[PDB]
Amino acid sequence: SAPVVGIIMGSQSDWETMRHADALLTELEIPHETLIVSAFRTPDRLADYARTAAERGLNVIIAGAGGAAHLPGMCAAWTRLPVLGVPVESRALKGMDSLLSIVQMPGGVPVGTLAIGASGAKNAALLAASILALYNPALAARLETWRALQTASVPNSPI
Amino acid sequence: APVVGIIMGSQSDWETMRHADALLTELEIPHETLIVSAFRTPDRLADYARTAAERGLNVIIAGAGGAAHLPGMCAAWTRLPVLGVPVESRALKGMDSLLSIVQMPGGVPVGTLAIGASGAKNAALLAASILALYNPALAARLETWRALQTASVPNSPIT
Amino acid sequence: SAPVVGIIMGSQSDWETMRHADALLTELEIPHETLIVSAFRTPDRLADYARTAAERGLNVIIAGAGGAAHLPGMCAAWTRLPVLGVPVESRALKGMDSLLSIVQMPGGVPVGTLAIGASGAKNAALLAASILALYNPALAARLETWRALQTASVPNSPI
Amino acid sequence: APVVGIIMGSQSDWETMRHADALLTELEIPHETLIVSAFRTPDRLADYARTAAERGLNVIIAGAGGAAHLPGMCAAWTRLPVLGVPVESRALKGMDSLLSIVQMPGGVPVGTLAIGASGAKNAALLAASILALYNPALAARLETWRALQTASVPNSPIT
Amino acid sequence: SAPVVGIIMGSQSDWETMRHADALLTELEIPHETLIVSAFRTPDRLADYARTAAERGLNVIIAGAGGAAHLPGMCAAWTRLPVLGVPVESRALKGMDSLLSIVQMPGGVPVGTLAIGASGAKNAALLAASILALYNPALAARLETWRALQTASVPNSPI
Amino acid sequence: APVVGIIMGSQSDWETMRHADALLTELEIPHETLIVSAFRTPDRLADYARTAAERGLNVIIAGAGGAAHLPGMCAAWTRLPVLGVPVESRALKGMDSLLSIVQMPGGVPVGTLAIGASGAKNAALLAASILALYNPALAARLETWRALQTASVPNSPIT
Amino acid sequence: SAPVVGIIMGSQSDWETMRHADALLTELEIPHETLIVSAFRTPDRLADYARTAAERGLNVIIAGAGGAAHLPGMCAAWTRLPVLGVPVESRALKGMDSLLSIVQMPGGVPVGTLAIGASGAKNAALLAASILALYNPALAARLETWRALQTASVPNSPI
Amino acid sequence: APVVGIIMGSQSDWETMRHADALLTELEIPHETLIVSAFRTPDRLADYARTAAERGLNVIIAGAGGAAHLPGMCAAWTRLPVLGVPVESRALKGMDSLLSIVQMPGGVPVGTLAIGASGAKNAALLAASILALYNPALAARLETWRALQTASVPNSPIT
């Protein structure tokens, strides 16, 4: 019932990308919340969100943003919870700015970074699932089924 | 019994991965450290990744440089969360390492950290934050470690 | 009759690119097989395919994939046969991630890499042809004709 | 009383930021120099930026390397103009520093300078040109400094 | 009445981008002029514009150009006023050439650089506003309102 | 009689190409090693490539750095498979070497290897795997070499 | 009557770009020839063209190609005439491969390189014009008029 | 009387530009060598470029690093052909130098050479090939120089 994963994104423009994380979590029946939190436009909203995440029962935070993407890193700065980052594809630099802004965190405050775009959003949800599966047998079995179906469903020849 | 497995493509990667090893030990997290080449010992990798969960491992930290396939292929064979450390390469300064690890397509995640030593240290910290989710004692040690890091930052530079 | 060249690709999405390799081989009447094999979604399928390629009579393997493209490298890890890699153009990084993931193989396990995209797929087939031509006189003559026609057909002035 | 605040992520940034300090002193601009980590001391940053205006600061010069979020997050909490200095990073030579600082989305600006020492010196000069707008005495000193720079350029190289 | 900010751009093609700076200044009721000045096609027009800017009462200059974008730097070469640069997105290199041409100014002549594209144009206007606000109480209050509205208007969840 | 030809643009390339030479000798593959400049001795290159097949060569390994045209132009004049080795360049670290070799348009292939020493060694191994297709004795030596490489990988790092 | 400038391009696909060079030369009434010459598909055509250019009365050669663009460099390898290179925008790497393949010529064989794309094609023609103007008074005057019109025609404000 | 002018942004550029100087002297081409800063001495540059033609100069070779505007701005003020040499920069290895010089929009050309020493030497050679068009004696010396370069290439490396 209560969310165990929090999906936060810099803006509505990131939804086209982060919706893939939302869909995957729902598919695996992982209770979660999906919100918009801007590191630069709503810094206090982020501080409060990240600082209280653990208290509220969250276990993993998936954060996505583009350009000078500080959302994942700053979220990790306030929480002890694992933070996964999704580099959203930017218009000009195609997410290279997003990627470097998120993955290059100095030692001390980590952000598990996924691929640029939709693939990254989907994988952040799967990585969050693999983390929760460590202490949730039922979910672990559903994740096994998901991975097994992925593998079995790959065609043998192109159409 | 090890709960985290640190694997790397070669002895040359140890200079970087030793930082992950030291941090896990610092936080009192039992782990194993091995060399597994995705290219030279593919079957060793398959077996290592396949059996990781049954052997008791909860998280795998994989480091490699250049065309770094170790993290991704490890993740392909295990349902456990896999964290990747891009080892700095001579010519491309780890950019090839970074892209070959972080850009996983949807379906098989690799939580990627920064290029080099910072990434190795952060892979260990991220692994710790994942384990802390179901280990109160470790959660406390991690909280203390994070709090100390924050309290240890100087207020002014030695000008 | 029996295939002497194997064309494998990471997914159906790579077909738009790899079809150019298929077409060229057919044009030169080189018996081949065209399959989908995912390094990360179907790792065991890849291990089995690459390991048994030589036994099955294959002489060259053309592998194409995009993003963190491990298909060519991992295929080369299990076979003694020459492996040619085609970097498929990725959405965000335009195949730069694909290229570095394939070409930057460390010493010991090579992958002859071609250009990003359609040109690369076509050239992988031609390179495979030039390899087979070394011990197939009939094919050698057909390849000579193909190269001669390419050269003679270039217009002298633009339209 | 300080009118410009120079902040940096760590002591390692001082080698670069000292150039901003020296230039402000040269132009007789009162300022403070502090270490504030966006990741290790997020609340220290929030408080510093929030109160800057009321404390009398007119401009903030922030320097950081790698995933450099200090300039952007500082700007998120202050209405004052914030200038960013990308500190050169080991692997990516400051490219990660540059993109993570300059690529701010619309709404929260960071006037970015060049990677390294030149950027730090220019951040100080830019701050000076901003203060000169309402400080006749400083405007005169700056004019003299610029005029001297121009007059000091040699006409031929020492061949 | 008289302009206090000058917006100059390399050509009509830059208008699609620089119009965002114009709109923001008008929104905050900051008197300004918007002109086309080419560093390479109209070098003398630029020299005269930049040299006389201060005399004419201008306080800040916002310059935007793409490709080998010299407009901001050369403008700064002739004026003591703060110059803000907007890298216009170029067709082939997506503004990376524009960005490096503007931000990498050597020590001695600064250019406060903003993000590539529309975001950068908007932020250059906001940065110019934050500079003018230092000595214009009425504007300072309007800027506070603008920043407050930006923060308060961010949705809490995606649509 | 040589069956593989190793050519390079200058003596400076030898530091890198010597690795290809050593490996071929190790596998007992007869070969020749020459310096041929695509830019300084274009006619020497034309003649070398044109006559390679009739001289008994089966594979050509070409190495060059910077604007590396040697591999591509060699391939333009021979029907034989040409392997390219991007030699590391001073400023761009071999990125210019890599792109100028691998990006061949459709019709004239160059199997490209990694930048530097690894690429040179792999060019030799790839050439060996091509020759092994019709040389049982060599095929056996290569199999033994690959098997030894796999068996020689340590299980743990010297911590 | 007889051509004094030769415009050569790798293929019909380059025409969309090189037509801008053709148009400019015609505009300035500079007699020229426009041809398709492929460095890799028609190497002998290139050797003959470049080798005999001077004898035929050509003074400048403008060469354009994309990807691993060797046309300009190899042309310069056979002629003593000034060779100007135009990097054609490639599909995946947007001309970055074209640019590095052309501009990074080692010492001894130069290629005056222009911008990627249409701008580069136009500028190659203008640069060729500025070269011919050194010893053709009539053309020199027409070039002066062209440059004067360019400067005078730049609008003062955007529409 | 000088027919070629070599200009550079600073004494630090001399280490690179001295190669252009030495080559012109080698070919007996009268020239002048000066330091002209586009940013620190903009009016000196305007005057230098404006009067170049009337002073007898036929070609200008300009070198600069980082945000290298010297070549482009020089070309903006002269009708003479301007050749640009990207001087290697500390952090970005001359990539910023290269893009800021070569990417000139249509209308004002700069024939760009390679980053560093090779580019400086080639700028001199390109200038020589331009002057040789109307100087028989020089044309002969250049022909001899090119012929010697070709004849001086070794046939095999010192293994």
mmCIF file of C-alpha atoms in Angstrom, chain G:
data_model
loop_
_atom_site.group_PDB
_atom_site.id
_atom_site.type_symbol
_atom_site.label_atom_id
_atom_site.label_comp_id
_atom_site.label_asym_id
_atom_site.label_seq_id
_atom_site.Cartn_x
_atom_site.Cartn_y
_atom_site.Cartn_z
ATOM 1 C CA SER G 1 37.134 29.832 -70.334
ATOM 2 C CA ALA G 2 39.408 27.073 -69.025
ATOM 3 C CA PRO G 3 38.743 26.086 -65.382
ATOM 4 C CA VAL G 4 41.057 27.543 -62.741
ATOM 5 C CA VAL G 5 39.303 25.863 -59.827
ATOM 6 C CA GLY G 6 38.317 22.241 -59.571
ATOM 7 C CA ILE G 7 35.490 21.171 -57.290
ATOM 8 C CA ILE G 8 35.537 17.451 -56.552
ATOM 9 C CA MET G 9 33.256 15.518 -54.223
ATOM 10 C CA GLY G 10 33.090 11.944 -52.981
ATOM 11 C CA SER G 11 29.627 11.219 -54.383
ATOM 12 C CA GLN G 12 26.257 12.507 -55.570
ATOM 13 C CA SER G 13 25.194 12.614 -51.918
ATOM 14 C CA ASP G 14 27.757 15.379 -51.351
ATOM 15 C CA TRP G 15 26.191 17.577 -54.049
ATOM 16 C CA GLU G 16 23.546 19.012 -51.710
ATOM 17 C CA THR G 17 26.512 20.491 -49.842
ATOM 18 C CA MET G 18 29.078 21.192 -52.568
ATOM 19 C CA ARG G 19 26.551 22.940 -54.834
ATOM 20 C CA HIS G 20 27.089 25.964 -52.582
ATOM 21 C CA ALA G 21 30.730 26.113 -53.655
ATOM 22 C CA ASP G 22 29.702 25.793 -57.302
ATOM 23 C CA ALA G 23 27.144 28.596 -56.977
ATOM 24 C CA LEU G 24 29.607 30.989 -55.341
ATOM 25 C CA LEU G 25 32.282 30.444 -57.990
ATOM 26 C CA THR G 26 29.728 31.039 -60.748
ATOM 27 C CA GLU G 27 28.539 34.158 -58.929
ATOM 28 C CA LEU G 28 32.075 35.564 -58.934
ATOM 29 C CA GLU G 29 32.511 34.405 -62.542
ATOM 30 C CA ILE G 30 35.399 32.069 -61.741
ATOM 31 C CA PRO G 31 35.746 29.387 -64.460
ATOM 32 C CA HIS G 32 35.635 25.965 -62.819
ATOM 33 C CA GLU G 33 34.797 22.287 -63.208
ATOM 34 C CA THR G 34 32.579 20.256 -60.876
ATOM 35 C CA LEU G 35 33.183 16.522 -60.659
ATOM 36 C CA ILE G 36 32.586 13.414 -58.590
ATOM 37 C CA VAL G 37 35.784 11.633 -57.551
ATOM 38 C CA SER G 38 35.813 8.931 -54.878
ATOM 39 C CA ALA G 39 39.041 8.415 -52.950
ATOM 40 C CA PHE G 40 38.068 4.835 -52.131
ATOM 41 C CA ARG G 41 35.765 3.815 -55.006
ATOM 42 C CA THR G 42 37.809 5.472 -57.779
ATOM 43 C CA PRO G 43 41.368 5.782 -56.380
ATOM 44 C CA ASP G 44 43.027 5.825 -59.803
ATOM 45 C CA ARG G 45 40.627 8.502 -61.027
ATOM 46 C CA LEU G 46 41.736 10.606 -58.052
ATOM 47 C CA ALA G 47 45.454 9.946 -58.606
ATOM 48 C CA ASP G 48 45.167 10.992 -62.250
ATOM 49 C CA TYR G 49 42.993 14.017 -61.461
ATOM 50 C CA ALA G 50 45.244 15.379 -58.711
ATOM 51 C CA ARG G 51 48.516 14.565 -60.506
ATOM 52 C CA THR G 52 47.492 16.388 -63.691
ATOM 53 C CA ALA G 53 45.579 19.286 -62.117
ATOM 54 C CA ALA G 54 48.436 21.796 -62.356
ATOM 55 C CA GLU G 55 49.246 20.821 -65.955
ATOM 56 C CA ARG G 56 45.613 21.356 -66.920
ATOM 57 C CA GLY G 57 45.771 24.911 -65.620
ATOM 58 C CA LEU G 58 43.979 24.449 -62.305
ATOM 59 C CA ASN G 59 45.080 26.790 -59.511
ATOM 60 C CA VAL G 60 42.983 25.603 -56.568
ATOM 61 C CA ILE G 61 41.127 22.395 -55.768
ATOM 62 C CA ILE G 62 38.085 22.297 -53.487
ATOM 63 C CA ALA G 63 37.379 18.782 -52.243
ATOM 64 C CA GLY G 64 34.427 17.651 -50.164
ATOM 65 C CA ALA G 65 33.576 14.279 -48.631
ATOM 66 C CA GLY G 66 31.990 12.782 -45.521
ATOM 67 C CA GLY G 67 32.701 10.106 -42.919
ATOM 68 C CA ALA G 68 36.251 8.791 -43.190
ATOM 69 C CA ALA G 69 36.816 11.630 -45.672
ATOM 70 C CA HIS G 70 40.134 11.010 -47.424
ATOM 71 C CA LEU G 71 39.404 12.834 -50.679
ATOM 72 C CA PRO G 72 40.977 16.196 -49.728
ATOM 73 C CA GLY G 73 44.086 14.708 -48.127
ATOM 74 C CA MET G 74 44.844 12.207 -50.857
ATOM 75 C CA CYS G 75 44.248 14.863 -53.509
ATOM 76 C CA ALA G 76 46.804 17.071 -51.747
ATOM 77 C CA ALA G 77 49.174 14.091 -51.690
ATOM 78 C CA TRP G 78 49.432 14.163 -55.511
ATOM 79 C CA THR G 79 49.267 17.887 -56.286
ATOM 80 C CA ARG G 80 51.424 20.889 -55.400
ATOM 81 C CA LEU G 81 48.333 23.077 -55.755
ATOM 82 C CA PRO G 82 46.526 24.426 -52.675
ATOM 83 C CA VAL G 83 43.781 22.013 -51.640
ATOM 84 C CA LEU G 84 40.792 23.212 -49.625
ATOM 85 C CA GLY G 85 38.662 20.667 -47.813
ATOM 86 C CA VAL G 86 34.961 20.680 -47.027
ATOM 87 C CA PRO G 87 33.782 18.256 -44.317
ATOM 88 C CA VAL G 88 30.386 16.977 -45.442
ATOM 89 C CA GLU G 89 27.905 16.387 -42.638
ATOM 90 C CA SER G 90 27.610 12.655 -42.000
ATOM 91 C CA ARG G 91 24.409 10.997 -40.802
ATOM 92 C CA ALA G 92 25.568 9.614 -37.451
ATOM 93 C CA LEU G 93 28.496 11.760 -36.331
ATOM 94 C CA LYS G 94 27.294 14.997 -37.952
ATOM 95 C CA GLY G 95 30.564 15.657 -39.758
ATOM 96 C CA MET G 96 32.858 15.285 -36.755
ATOM 97 C CA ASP G 97 34.363 12.231 -38.435
ATOM 98 C CA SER G 98 34.525 14.192 -41.702
ATOM 99 C CA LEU G 99 36.215 17.133 -39.965
ATOM 100 C CA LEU G 100 38.897 15.182 -38.116
ATOM 101 C CA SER G 101 39.616 13.066 -41.213
ATOM 102 C CA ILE G 102 40.340 16.227 -43.198
ATOM 103 C CA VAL G 103 41.846 18.809 -40.838
ATOM 104 C CA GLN G 104 44.260 16.595 -38.887
ATOM 105 C CA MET G 105 46.758 16.242 -41.734
ATOM 106 C CA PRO G 106 50.327 15.594 -40.499
ATOM 107 C CA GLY G 107 53.070 18.064 -41.378
ATOM 108 C CA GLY G 108 54.138 17.962 -45.006
ATOM 109 C CA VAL G 109 50.831 17.727 -46.876
ATOM 110 C CA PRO G 110 48.329 20.479 -46.027
ATOM 111 C CA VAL G 111 44.595 20.812 -46.584
ATOM 112 C CA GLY G 112 42.995 24.158 -45.779
ATOM 113 C CA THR G 113 39.836 23.020 -44.016
ATOM 114 C CA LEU G 114 36.523 24.890 -43.846
ATOM 115 C CA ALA G 115 33.433 24.425 -41.653
ATOM 116 C CA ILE G 116 31.251 21.325 -41.709
ATOM 117 C CA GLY G 117 28.481 21.557 -44.304
ATOM 118 C CA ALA G 118 27.072 24.272 -46.548
ATOM 119 C CA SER G 119 28.941 27.088 -44.801
ATOM 120 C CA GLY G 120 32.192 25.263 -45.445
ATOM 121 C CA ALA G 121 31.386 24.690 -49.116
ATOM 122 C CA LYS G 122 30.568 28.376 -49.567
ATOM 123 C CA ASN G 123 33.710 29.446 -47.707
ATOM 124 C CA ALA G 124 35.948 27.091 -49.687
ATOM 125 C CA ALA G 125 34.792 28.878 -52.841
ATOM 126 C CA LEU G 126 35.379 32.282 -51.229
ATOM 127 C CA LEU G 127 38.811 31.226 -49.992
ATOM 128 C CA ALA G 128 39.620 29.964 -53.493
ATOM 129 C CA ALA G 129 38.446 33.348 -54.767
ATOM 130 C CA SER G 130 40.656 35.240 -52.307
ATOM 131 C CA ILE G 131 43.609 33.178 -53.529
ATOM 132 C CA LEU G 132 42.942 33.851 -57.224
ATOM 133 C CA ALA G 133 42.343 37.542 -56.439
ATOM 134 C CA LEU G 134 46.007 37.861 -55.477
ATOM 135 C CA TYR G 135 46.907 37.826 -59.174
ATOM 136 C CA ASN G 136 43.646 38.715 -60.935
ATOM 137 C CA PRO G 137 42.743 42.429 -60.474
ATOM 138 C CA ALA G 138 39.301 42.131 -62.078
ATOM 139 C CA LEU G 139 38.331 39.240 -59.814
ATOM 140 C CA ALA G 140 39.869 41.024 -56.838
ATOM 141 C CA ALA G 141 37.470 43.910 -57.428
ATOM 142 C CA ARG G 142 34.482 41.571 -57.742
ATOM 143 C CA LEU G 143 35.465 39.860 -54.476
ATOM 144 C CA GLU G 144 35.754 43.260 -52.787
ATOM 145 C CA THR G 145 32.244 44.067 -53.999
ATOM 146 C CA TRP G 146 30.961 40.705 -52.747
ATOM 147 C CA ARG G 147 32.472 41.220 -49.278
ATOM 148 C CA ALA G 148 31.252 44.824 -49.193
ATOM 149 C CA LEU G 149 27.708 43.761 -50.076
ATOM 150 C CA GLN G 150 27.764 41.033 -47.434
ATOM 151 C CA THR G 151 28.735 43.582 -44.790
ATOM 152 C CA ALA G 152 26.322 46.290 -45.909
ATOM 153 C CA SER G 153 23.379 43.874 -46.218
ATOM 154 C CA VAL G 154 23.335 42.638 -42.621
ATOM 155 C CA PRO G 155 20.097 43.940 -41.018
ATOM 156 C CA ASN G 156 20.358 46.123 -37.924
ATOM 157 C CA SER G 157 17.486 44.476 -36.076
ATOM 158 C CA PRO G 158 15.727 41.093 -36.262
ATOM 159 C CA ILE G 159 12.328 40.640 -37.897
#
